[PDB]
């Protein structure tokens, strides 16, 4: 449904909005593993995902339905939990942004 | 009878049911008692109720095809809670704390 | 071959280099159809491609071989030719950058 | 590259190296002011600068001498000090990276 993907577009705009910027910013663009010297990042994370990639896929009309959109957003969070120790700042930030995502996604008509 | 991935999923379920998480897991142990709570619209809004006892029985019955089906049921349980409730309800805060345990352990699956 | 994709990474770095910026810049990021007022862009171009997308796919190890890399770079140029009239400045820039790409790609060991 | 610009290239490689990544990463690419909701960033900062811009200029042989290189690196730090309050994490990181830069630059033959 166009209606479902319109709601998904609204969720993405919320995740990218200034009120969430203090915990969303690590997810705005791909993790720059090369720049950070994370030589194992692409060994451990086979399918990187970030909000810019989700936005481009939405603009390109690449999502068949809301479930495909949700799978990419959850992949982004799962990658973060998979790669990082539980006490890293970025894990606390992922959890805060995921709470926003899961709540808005659950309210989809 | 359980695959390596579904054995890890069984370990996650045992953790979600364990005493250390009881202070925020207990609302998810059994079905939402809509009658007792006076929730006359609960089953109008939530078409597919799910709780940890349902997931446990499906695991014991070997009803899960793979880890993704397990994760879908656990996320359905949390999504039902977010769908029905306002964001400031105590049960939503509890759902978020338990979901953080689930998502972290699920992501670390060999 | 790792060797082939290493050469492809060298080609991408050349396409992104300052010496080609005068004709490469329209290809650095996805076409901003909203900003340009291009209401039909995503109706006509079903599979957008740009050098930032190619770079992310390379870093993610999404390319199986040099041929898959070349197919995405040629898709980027083909989208530009498909959407635009032959006298548009962006078509002249696409041709100049494609000459750099085709020449370097042909010289691959 | 001249002898002095070869030393400047060695400084750039050090600033981009893994040992400094914990405080260098905010300077790797242009500040994404739009993504962070910093609506006034380009009103306050007239000449953005970052290590990727310096690296592209160095690769293109655009620096006339070591002083032009030093001016761009100091502009990057000055932009950070100009825009930010003194207690922001990014200001502490700028100071740590600038200490590496100033020390190595001073030792240039
Ligand atoms: C969010 C965050 C806070 C912080 F204080 C330091 C870092 C490095 C940090 O994470 C990032 C900062 C910048 C970027 C850019 C913009 C360069 O792409 C990415 C991250 C980052 C994002 N995500 C989603 C991660 O999962 C992740 C992991 C790491 C990381 C960096 N260093 C480690 C690390 C190093 C040694 C041992 C174990 C982990 N892990 O950095 C990020
Ligand atoms: C955890 C919790 C704390 C609290 F202070 C009040 C309630 C109702 C609460 O949640 C439950 C308490 C008991 C039970 C029993 C054991 C009787 O089944 C269930 C819940 C409960 C669990 N789940 C998973 C829910 O999604 C949910 C929703 C509600 C609920 C009750 N009232 C509301 C509500 C109030 C105002 C506006 C909208 C919804 N929502 O209660 C539960
Ligand atoms: C390069 C260039 C020169 C120019 F004079 C005018 C434009 C629009 C132009 O192209 C772009 C300028 C900016 C951007 C941004 C940065 C906003 O994303 C994109 C383009 C651009 C890139 N690509 C790859 C294109 O294929 C394309 C097509 C168009 C375009 C805009 N208007 C037309 C057009 C006009 C009349 C009839 C048919 C098409 N075509 O703009 C771009
Ligand atoms: C380094 C750092 C730590 C942190 F906890 C939060 C932020 C926002 C941060 O800075 C950045 C994080 C990500 C990025 C990306 C990769 C998105 O481009 C950039 C910065 C960042 C880099 N530089 C060089 C800055 O000067 C700057 C300033 C800010 C910033 C964000 N918010 C403020 C601010 C807040 C209140 C009053 C004034 C300024 N300043 O963020 C950056
Ligand atoms: Na060919
Ligand atoms: Na900006």
Swiss-Prot record, chains A, C, D:
Changing residue 38 to A: Reduced binding to histone H4 acetylated at 'Lys-12' (H4K12ac). Residues 1-108 form the Bromo domain. It comes from the Eukaryota. It is found in: Nucleus; Chromosome. The first bromo domain specifically recognizes histone H4 acetylated at 'Lys-12' (H4K12ac). It also specifically binds histone H4 acetyl-methylated at 'Lys-5' and 'Lys-12' (H4K5acme and H4K12acme, respectively). The second bromo domain recognizes and binds histone H4 acetylated at 'Lys-5' and 'Lys-12' (H4K5ac and H4K12ac, respectively). Homodimer. Interacts with E2F1. Interacts with (acetylated) STAT3; promoting STAT3 recruitment to chromatin. Interacts with CTCF; promoting BRD2 recruitment to chromatin. Belongs to the BET family. Chromatin reader protein that specifically recognizes and binds histone H4 acetylated at 'Lys-5' and 'Lys-12' (H4K5ac and H4K12ac, respectively), thereby controlling gene expression and remodeling chromatin structures. Recruits transcription factors and coactivators to target gene sites, and activates RNA polymerase II machinery for transcriptional elongation. Some specific inhibitors of BRD2 that prevent binding to acetylated histone are promising therapeutic molecules for the treatment of cancers or inflammatory diseases. ABBV-744, a small molecule, has been tested on tumors with success: ABBV-744 antiproliferative activity is mainly restricted to cell lines of acute myeloid leukaemia and prostate cancer and is able to displace BRD4 from chromatin. GSK046 (iBET-BD2), which specifically inhibits the second bromo domain, is a promising therapeutic small molecule for the treatment of inflammatory and autoimmune diseases. This is Bromodomain-containing protein 2. It comes from Homo sapiens.
